[PDB]
Amino acid sequence: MNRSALDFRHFVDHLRRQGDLVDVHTEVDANLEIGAITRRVYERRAPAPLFHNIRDSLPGARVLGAPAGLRADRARAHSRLALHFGLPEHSGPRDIVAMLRAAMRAEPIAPRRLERGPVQENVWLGEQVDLTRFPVPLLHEQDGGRYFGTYGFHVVQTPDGSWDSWSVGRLMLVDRNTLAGPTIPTQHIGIIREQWRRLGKPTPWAMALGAPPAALAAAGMPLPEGVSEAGYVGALVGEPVEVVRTQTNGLWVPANTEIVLEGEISLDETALEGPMGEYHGYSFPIGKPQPLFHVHALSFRDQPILPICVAGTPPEENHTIWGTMISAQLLDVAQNAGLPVDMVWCSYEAATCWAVLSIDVQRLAALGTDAAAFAARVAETVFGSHAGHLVPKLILVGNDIDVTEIDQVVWALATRAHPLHDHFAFPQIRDFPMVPYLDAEDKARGSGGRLVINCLYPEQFAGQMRAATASFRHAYPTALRRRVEERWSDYGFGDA
Amino acid sequence: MNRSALDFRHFVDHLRRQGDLVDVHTEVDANLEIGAITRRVYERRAPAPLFHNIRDSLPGARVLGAPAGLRADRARAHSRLALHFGLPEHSGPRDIVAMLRAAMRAEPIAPRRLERGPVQENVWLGEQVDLTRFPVPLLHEQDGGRYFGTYGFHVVQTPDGSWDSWSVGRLMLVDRNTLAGPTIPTQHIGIIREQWRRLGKPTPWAMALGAPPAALAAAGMPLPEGVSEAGYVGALVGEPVEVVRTQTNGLWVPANTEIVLEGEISLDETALEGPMGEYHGYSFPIGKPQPLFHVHALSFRDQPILPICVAGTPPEENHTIWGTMISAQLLDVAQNAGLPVDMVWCSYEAATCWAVLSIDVQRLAALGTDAAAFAARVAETVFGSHAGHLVPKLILVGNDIDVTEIDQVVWALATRAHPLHDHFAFPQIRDFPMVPYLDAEDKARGSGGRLVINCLYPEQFAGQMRAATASFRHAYPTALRRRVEERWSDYGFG
C-alpha cells in the first residue's frame, strides 16, 4: 500500500490485489472504444480496466483507464483515490484532506537524484520519436484530436532554477513529434512559460505519464505559487521522490515513470487544439489555438502503461483528483486566513463547479457579522487564492451537516437558503474561463460567474439556531441512541 | 400485489414475503424507542419494522414503522412505496407518476357500501374510549406530546353530501378521548371545516389508521378541490374501495381499516399542539393552539396494527408519499396548462422543499420566450394550484437530465444556473406557512419564500444547446455503446 504512492506500476499491481482492477485481454480500439469502456467504468463505479491489447499500437504497450475512479462499494468508494497516497481502502474525503494538510506543514523532502531508472529502458531520440506508435486515444466522439496526455504532468523549472513545477494539463497529439495544449496564464505552467518568454526563449519541458501516484495527485493540486510540488510529495510520503535527468534538457523527472516526453514549449507556434470532453461534463464544439509542445526525445519502461482520464460527467479524476486537491488547499487557505471553516469539499456531483464550506458555528458569533459581510469576506479570501480562483460557486453552511454528503448539502440548500437574502453574486471578481455557464458578456468582461450561496440562518450569526434536527442523531438522547445501536441486530435487523 | 393496495394487513404480509419486513419480538418502549428505531430505519433504508411487544399497551396491538420508507437495494429502492399502488418491486418514480396520472383521466369508481367489515371486530363507545391504551408513541425527544395519528387520514364530508374528503394530517393525543391537530385553511380539511362553521356547527369526522395503502396515498395527494379521494382510489386500482358507516356520525370509512376514530372537530375549543419533528427536517421549539378532535367512539380489527411516520430528515413518508403525490399532481397541472413539462419531481433529498420540472426542449423554441418570462409563467401556474402552493422552490431544467436523480439535478444546478440571470424570487406570491427558512417579515406579509431557479441555458429558448454532454450515453455512437454493453463480460467485468 505504501510503495503504491511512489511507483505507478506497483500501484496497478496493488489495485489488482484489492480486487479493484480488471485485466482486459481482448483487443480494443484506441479509436473511441477505450474511452467508451472507461466512461462506463466511471459511471458504474466499476474496477479500473488495464488494457493489454490495443489495436495498431507498439507491441506490449498498455493503457490504464479510470486511475482514480470511484468504487460501487460505498464503504470502499474512495479507495483508488486513497491509494494514490498509500492510504487504506476505507479512507474517505476527510482522511485524505487531513493527510494533505499535514504534508503542507511538514518540511519538504527534496527529490533524490539517481543515475539510472526503469523509465530509461527504452529511449527514442530525434527522428526515432513517433508518438503515433503509442495507443493514443480518441477519447470522445466529438473531440478535435487524440490525446496523448490526460493523466500526466508537465515538468518545467524557473530560468533561475529556484522553482520546480509539476502540473497536470492536457496534451493533444498533433503529429509524430508534436503535441499541443493549453497553458492558462494563471496556472503555474503559464506563469513559468511567461518567465522564459521574457528572456526570448521557449520553455524547456517534459511530461511524466504513469508517474508516482502521489506526484500525479500533487501535480493536480493548486499549491501556492513558488512551492515545488516534488518537495511537497516527499513531505507527504515521508521520503524522497527518486528522479533522473532527461536525455536532452536537464530536467529531473521521476525515475520509475512509465513514459517521459521531453522537448520544449514553443514561443509562438500554435495548432488548433481541442475540443475535448471536459471536467464540467460537456463537449463544446470548437477548439482554439494552443502552443506547440515539441517532443525532441522520449523514454519509456518496457510494456509501458499509458494512464488516461476520459473526462466528463462525474465522478472522474477532474473530480476525484482535482476537486479533492482543491478542497484540501482551500481549507488551508480558509483556516490560515482566520475564517471559521472546519472543512471544504468540492462535491464530485457538482463537477468541480462549487465548493462547500463547513462553518464552525461555535466561532461565528464572535465575528459580530452577518450573511452579506461574511459572504464578501469569504469571496475575497477564497476567490483571491490560487486554488479558489478555480471554483466559481461557494456554498456556506453550518458544520452540523456533513459537507462531503451531497444529500445533506441538498437539504441545507433547500431548507436554509432564503431566496431574497442568501444569493450573493460577485460580478466584479474575475472568472476561471472554463466555467460552462459563462455567456459572451461574461467572456468579454472577464467576470460575471462568481457566487456565494449562504445557508447560515440569520440567528447563527448570534450563536443560535431556530430549530433542532429531526434525525436519529439529533432527536433522541445519547443513552437511547446507544441502546438502539447496541440492540440493532438483536431487534432483527442484523446488517440492515 | 393488487390486494396489498386495498388491504393494509395484506400489505404487511406481502412486505414480509418480499423480505422487506422485520418482526420485532423484543420488548420496546413507545416512549421514544420505537421512534428512534424507525428513524434509523429510514436513514439506513432498512426493512420496515413490525413491533409486536410494546410496554404498557393493549394486548395484541402492534405498530408498523416506515410504512413507505426506502430500501438500500437501489434496484428495489421504491418497492414499499410502489406496493401502496399494487406496483411491483422495481417500479420507480416515473412508473408511479404515470399510474397516478392515468387514474386522473379514468372515470371515478365510487366506494362499495358494505354492512359489516373487520374494522368492527372491536367497538368502544363513549366512556369505553381510552386512546391511551394503544401504543401511542412519543416520536421525537422534544415533541410536545405523543402522536396517535401520523399515518392515517381524516374523513369528512360537505354539509351538502357532494364531496367526501380523505386527507392525511397529524393528530396529537390530549387525553383518553381527545386529540388535537392542525387544519390549515388552504387544506381540504380546513375548507370543509369552514363550511360547517358557516352553519354554526362542528364537523363530523373520522380518522382511518392502517387504511388501505392506496387510500392512504390518495389521502396524501393534493387532488383538486371537490374531487372525492375515494373515487380516485377506485379508479386507480380498478375497483371499489369497500366502506362501512361509522357507529355514531354517518361517515363511510374503509371496511378493512385497522383502527377507526370518530367524533367531531370542535368549532372553538383548542389545546396546545406540537411541536413535532416535521417534514422539512427540523424540530421547531414551540407549539401552537389547535382544534380539539373529540373522539366519541372508535373501532378496530383484532390485533390492530398502528402505522406511524417518524417525520424529519429524508427520506420518510412526507417525502416518499407526500412528495411523490405532489409530483404527479404538478405534472398534470403543468401539462393541462400547456407548459412544455414532461416530468416533475420533488427530490426526496430536498425534504419536499423544491420541485424539479423537466422541460421538453423540443417544445421550448415555439414559445418565443426567455428565462425571466418563462419562470414567471411557471411560477403563476404552479404556485396557484393546490399542489404547487405546497412547495416554495422550483427548478427548471431541460429534459436531457433525469430529474428524479439528485446527482443529475446537482450537475445542472452547478453548471447551468447563472448567478446573475437565473435566480427568480417571487416575493408577492403567498407562501405555505411551514417553510422553514421564512423570517418575521415574511410571516407578517404572508409572502417572501418563493423562488424559481432557472437552469435552461439561454440558447435553449431558440432550440439550441451550447455543448453536448460528455458521458457514456452522449459521447459515443449508438453502435459503439451496444458493442461495449455486449462485450462487457468478454472484457473481464463479470
Ligand SMILES: Cc1cc2c3c(c1C)C(C)(C)CC=[N+]3c1c([nH]c(=O)[nH]c1=O)N2C[C@H](O)[C@H](O)[C@H](O)COP(=O)(O)O
Ligand atoms: C487532475 C487533472 C487536472 C487538470 C486536468 C486534467 C486532470 C485529469 C485533465 C488533463 C483530464 C483535463 C484538464 N487538465 C487540466 C488542468 N489544468 C489546466 O490548466 N489545463 C488542463 O488541461 N487540470 C488542473 C491542474 O492540474 C490543477 O489546477 C493544478 O493545480 C495545476 O498545477 P499548478 O497549480 O501548479 O499550476
Ligand SMILES: [K+]
Ligand atoms: K500542481
Ligand SMILES: [K+]
Ligand atoms: K388528499
Ligand SMILES: [Mn+2]
Ligand atoms: Mn504549482
Ligand SMILES: [Mn+2]
Ligand atoms: Mn382533497
